[PDB]
Amino acid sequence: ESEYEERRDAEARRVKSGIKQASIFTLEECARIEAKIDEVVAKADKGLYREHTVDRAPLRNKYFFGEGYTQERLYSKGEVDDIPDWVHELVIDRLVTHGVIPEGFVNSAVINDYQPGGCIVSHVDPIHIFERPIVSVSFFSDSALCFGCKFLFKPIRVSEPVLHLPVRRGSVTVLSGYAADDITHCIRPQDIKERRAVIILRKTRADAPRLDS
Ligand SMILES: O=C(O)CCC(=O)C(=O)O
Ligand SMILES: [Mn+2]
């Protein structure tokens, strides 16, 4: 019934207005990047990174490069590891060549690695920390990015998405405007049925607040 359908669809159009998607990477180019992601996981497992580079959760690990953060604040310089050369060579440079982002934009790369059933709770990328657009490239498997969900308790549930955005393996997702600023996004446990990883590429604001030593 409407007005529900009408009002949901109206906001979904607003969200979509701030979403651009690209492919660019072939599946063979994806497998190559996936091999590098596996190398990062292995290196972290051997404890070869700086402490704040690696954050571990039940079904999800995050790997912070370039900049890390926590009212959110960046860590002091040198607390997380530098962006690996392969992220520049295989991912950032490709997106620059294709005009998705300008040269020198990206100074933060985060890899999220999800096991089946993994998720990330609804949030807005800290607007006082990160410039827009926010760019992500997805790997290993197909999934979906949802907008506007609430993660509820008593009992545990995730509410209905305002927008459900399919994200194929190799998909490039570019968030701006409404989709980046005016609504949350998340990954629902139900949309991670197999291992999936994502590289999130961002520019920190020159005036982003930073912890001191
Ligand atoms: O997994 C994704 O595509 C997005 C993850 C995300 O939004 C985040 O890590 O801040
Ligand atoms: Mn996010």
mmCIF file of N, CA and C and ligand atoms in Angstrom, residues 69 112 120-121 123-126 134 145 175 185-186 200 202, ligand 2:
data_model
loop_
_atom_site.group_PDB
_atom_site.id
_atom_site.type_symbol
_atom_site.label_atom_id
_atom_site.label_comp_id
_atom_site.label_asym_id
_atom_site.label_seq_id
_atom_site.Cartn_x
_atom_site.Cartn_y
_atom_site.Cartn_z
ATOM 1 N N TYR A 69 41.021 5.270 12.700
ATOM 2 C CA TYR A 69 40.261 6.124 13.600
ATOM 3 C C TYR A 69 39.552 5.327 14.676
ATOM 4 N N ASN A 112 37.940 -4.585 4.760
ATOM 5 C CA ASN A 112 37.056 -5.359 5.626
ATOM 6 C C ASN A 112 36.949 -6.766 5.061
ATOM 7 N N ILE A 120 28.259 -5.377 9.169
ATOM 8 C CA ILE A 120 28.685 -4.119 9.762
ATOM 9 C C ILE A 120 27.446 -3.288 10.055
ATOM 10 N N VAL A 121 27.373 -2.829 11.298
ATOM 11 C CA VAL A 121 26.204 -2.144 11.819
ATOM 12 C C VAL A 121 26.027 -0.793 11.132
ATOM 13 N N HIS A 123 25.792 2.807 9.984
ATOM 14 C CA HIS A 123 26.591 3.961 10.372
ATOM 15 C C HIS A 123 26.662 4.945 9.216
ATOM 16 N N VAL A 124 27.131 6.153 9.528
ATOM 17 C CA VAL A 124 27.509 7.163 8.547
ATOM 18 C C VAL A 124 29.022 7.322 8.652
ATOM 19 N N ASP A 125 29.729 7.310 7.527
ATOM 20 C CA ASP A 125 31.174 7.523 7.584
ATOM 21 C C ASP A 125 31.404 8.925 8.147
ATOM 22 N N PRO A 126 32.231 9.023 9.201
ATOM 23 C CA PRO A 126 32.373 10.251 9.992
ATOM 24 C C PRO A 126 32.621 11.457 9.099
ATOM 25 N N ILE A 134 33.027 8.549 -1.025
ATOM 26 C CA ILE A 134 33.576 7.354 -0.395
ATOM 27 C C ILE A 134 33.508 6.240 -1.430
ATOM 28 N N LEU A 145 24.667 -3.898 -0.277
ATOM 29 C CA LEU A 145 24.829 -2.790 0.651
ATOM 30 C C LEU A 145 23.436 -2.246 0.948
ATOM 31 N N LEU A 175 29.889 6.563 -3.048
ATOM 32 C CA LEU A 175 28.867 7.208 -2.231
ATOM 33 C C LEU A 175 29.121 8.706 -2.077
ATOM 34 N N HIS A 185 24.458 3.396 6.151
ATOM 35 C CA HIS A 185 24.544 2.160 5.368
ATOM 36 C C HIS A 185 25.081 1.029 6.239
ATOM 37 N N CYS A 186 24.874 -0.199 5.777
ATOM 38 C CA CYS A 186 25.254 -1.374 6.538
ATOM 39 C C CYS A 186 25.403 -2.573 5.615
ATOM 40 N N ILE A 200 37.926 -0.109 1.068
ATOM 41 C CA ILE A 200 37.294 1.202 1.161
ATOM 42 C C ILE A 200 38.353 2.287 1.061
ATOM 43 N N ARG A 202 39.282 6.310 0.867
ATOM 44 C CA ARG A 202 38.759 7.574 1.330
ATOM 45 C C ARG A 202 39.843 8.631 1.435
HETATM 46 MN MN MN B 2 30.881 2.750 5.920
#
